[PDB]
């Protein structure tokens, strides 16, 4: 299944579009600063990102609607080193049909959804999920 495309701005103002990432695996996260699991999981994605970014896996952590400042504070507190976008009007969330939070979509290099993950992820899981969608 094709991942609905979207265009959003990351927390530095940069226009990011899903289809611009064709060729890379995309670890697509929907999250909010009130999710306990993301407090645990963002450090793990950060640490796996050190390894996977040069393998051609990208993270896109879609924050569901919160203020630039609430997001910035969460990113500093949990050592985030990956791209975060702002779903300001929560329209990408509805395009993805998401509930609960977090939910992660594993999108392969050809732009298709290979796995939808809800519920808890260990760092070992995150590792595997990223190997599942890496180009090489």
Swiss-Prot record:
Pathway: Protein modification; cytochrome c assembly. The lineage of its organism: Bacteria, Bacillati, Bacillota, Bacilli, Bacillales. It is found in: Cell membrane. Keywords: Cell membrane, Cytochrome c-type biogenesis, Disulfide bond, Membrane, Oxidoreductase, Redox-active center, Signal-anchor, Transmembrane, Transmembrane helix. It is a single-pass type II membrane protein. It comes from the Bacteria. GO terms for molecular function: antioxidant activity; disulfide oxidoreductase activity. Disulfide bonds join 35-38. Belongs to the thioredoxin family. ResA subfamily. The keyword Oxidoreductase applies. It comes from Bacillus subtilis (strain 168). This is Thiol-disulfide oxidoreductase ResA. Residues 1-135 form the Thioredoxin domain. The chain holds residues 40 to 175 of 179 of the full protein. GO terms for cellular component: plasma membrane. The keyword 4Fe-4S does not apply. GO terms for biological process: cytochrome complex assembly. Thiol-disulfide oxidoreductase which is required in disulfide reduction during c-type cytochrome synthesis. May accept reducing equivalents from CcdA, leading to breakage of disulfide bonds in apocytochrome c; following this reduction heme can be covalently attached. Does not play a role in sporulation.
């Amino acid at each position: 299944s094709d991942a609905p495309n979207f265009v959003l701005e990351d927390t530095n103002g940069k226009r990011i579009e899903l289809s611009d990432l064709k060729g890379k695996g995309v670890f697509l996260n929907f999250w909010g600063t009130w999710c306990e699991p993301c407090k645990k999981e963002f450090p793990y994605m950060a640490n796996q990102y050190k390894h996977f970014k040069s393998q051609g896996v990208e993270i896109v952590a879609v924050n569901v609607g919160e203020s630039k400042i609430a997001v910035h504070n969460f990113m500093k507190s949990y050592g985030v080193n990956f791209p975060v976008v702002l779903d300001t009007d929560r329209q990408v969330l509805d395009a993805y049909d998401v509930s609960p939070l977090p939910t992660t979509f594993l999108i392969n290099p050809e732009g298709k959804v290979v796995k939808v993950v809800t519920g808890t992820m260990t760092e070992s899981m995150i590792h595997d999920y990223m190997n599942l969608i890496k180009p090489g």
